[PDB]
Each structure stands twice: as structure tokens, then as C-alpha cells.
Amino acid sequence: LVNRTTLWGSAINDMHPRNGADYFTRVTLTMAKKGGLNFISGDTIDA
Amino acid sequence: LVNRTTLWGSAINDMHPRNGADYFTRVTLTMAKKGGLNFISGDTIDA
Incomplete structure (x- = not known):
């Protein structure tokens, strides 16, 4: 007597291999x- | 079966002989x- 749902998926999220940084x-x-x-x-920064 | 190509030429690129400097x-x-x-x-120099 349990209800359950699941989400699955794939994607790309990363920095480019050549000069990405x-x-x-x-x-x-x-x-x-x-x-x-x-x-x-409102006054001088440490005088 | 080797190909080859060359370039050649003459030019003058120098500073003037008479007081050029x-x-x-x-x-x-x-x-x-x-x-x-x-x-x-972005800061003052010696106050």
C-alpha cells in the first residue's frame, strides 16, 4: 500500500575541454x- | 612524389641614413x- 513516482533524465553541463576556463x-x-x-x-573610513 | 614551393624577394626596411633617429x-x-x-x-597614494 505505497505510492511512488520516479523521474529520470540526462543532460550535459560542463566546461569546454579547450580553453573553457x-x-x-x-x-x-x-x-x-x-x-x-x-x-x-556615513562618515570617513577610519579617518 | 614530393611537392615544394618557395617565395623570394628583396626590399629595404631601415631607418634613414641621415639623422633618422x-x-x-x-x-x-x-x-x-x-x-x-x-x-x-583605485586607492590614494600615500594619503
Whole structure:
């Protein structure tokens, strides 16, 4: 006395073998410049 | 059964015999000053 359903399927999701990774790049940002303005608090960034 | 093909020619590519070097100057860009903003990093230089 049990009911059950199942889904199966196949697909492709991967990076291209030739130079696939070279298309992407990462950038990280910071808020530390001397004499900067912190918009979170509204004043100078550590003076 | 080997094929082969060659190219040949003559040309002149050189700077002028008479004071030719006097038509070019090199300029080097410096990027350091007390009140400057770095384009590459986006931060002030020495406050």
C-alpha cells in the first residue's frame, strides 16, 4: 500500500575541454582607502 | 612524389641614413604622487 513516482533524465553541463576556463575571471573589492567615505555609516573610513 | 614551393624577394626596411633617429622620442609614464589616485588599484597614494 505505497505510492511512488520516479523521474529520470540526462543532460550535459560542463566546461569546454579547450580553453573553457580561460573565459572567466574573478574580481574582489575592498573598502579600505585612506580618506574614503563609508556609505554604510556615513562618515570617513577610519579617518 | 614530393611537392615544394618557395617565395623570394628583396626590399629595404631601415631607418634613414641621415639623422633618422631624430624623428622618435620615447616617453615613460610615472604613476606616483602625494595626492594621486591609482587607476589600477583605485586607492590614494600615500594619503
